[PDB]
Design a protein around this ligand. Structure first.
Ligand SMILES: Nc1nc2c(ncn2[C@@H]2O[C@H](COP(=O)(O)OP(=O)(O)O)[C@@H](O)[C@H]2O)c(=O)[nH]1
Ligand SMILES: [Mg+2]
Length: 181
């Protein structure tokens, strides 16, 4: 009749898992071989709280000219996902140092969901050994929440595209936030 439509943009450091998160949500299977730099614009059907919502998914990047093109993704958004990877504390530090200022510049007043990706790596032995070489460790859930509070984000959620853990909750949270906007 007239489906409810909302727009989502997802941003965050390169290789933090944005495109795979979109693919798993949309297509349902983790891509083991070919991953595009950005997912195709796609409209997701999200069932939340008894409503069918169409959520347009806008993927972004920074390599090449994608940084320059990124601002063209923000207009008329309803919800922003700022992502980092749990196996990369550097990518969490970039949330405050780079991403929040960008998002607030272009999307003042929109709800932001902070998303910790690659949850499956939190106890992964190779990840733990790699990070021990620079006296680092995986991001903890508390660390993610503390960043959420610092940036005024609407919610903090963790997920793993590889195991699919927490993916539905991400998009259900984002849709609920978008419906308020
Ligand atoms: N272990 C693990 N690896 C992931 C996950 N999501 C993405 N990857 C890997 O991380 C890399 C970057 O993923 P991608 O979605 O392209 O990151 P983007 O640059 O943020 O779009 C790829 O090698 C993926 O296979 C995840 O949930 N867990
Ligand atoms: Mg990508």
């Amino acid at each position: 009749m007239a489906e409810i439509r909302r727009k989502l943009v997802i941003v965050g450091d390169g290789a933090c898992g944005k495109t795979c998160l979109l693919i798993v949500n949309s297509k349902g299977t983790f891509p083991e071989v070919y991953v595009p730099t950005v997912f195709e614009n796609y409209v997701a059907d999200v069932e939340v709280d008894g409503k069918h919502v169409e959520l347009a998914l806008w993927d972004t990047a920074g390599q090449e000219d994608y940084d320059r093109l990124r601002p063209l993704s923000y207009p008329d958004s309803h919800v922003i996902l700022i992502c980092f990877a749990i196996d990369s504390p550097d990518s969490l530090d970039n949330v405050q140092e780079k991403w929040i200022s960008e998002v607030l510049h272009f999307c003042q007043g929109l709800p932001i969901i902070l998303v910790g990706c690659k949850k499956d790596l939190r106890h992964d032995p190779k990840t733990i050994e790699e990070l021990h070489k620079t006296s680092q460790k995986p991001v903890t859930p508390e660390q993610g929440e503390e960043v959420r509070k610092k940036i005024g984000a609407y919610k903090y959620l963790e997920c793993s595209a590889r195991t699919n853990e927490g993916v539905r909750e991400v998009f259900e949270a984002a849709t609920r936030a978008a419906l308020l906007t």
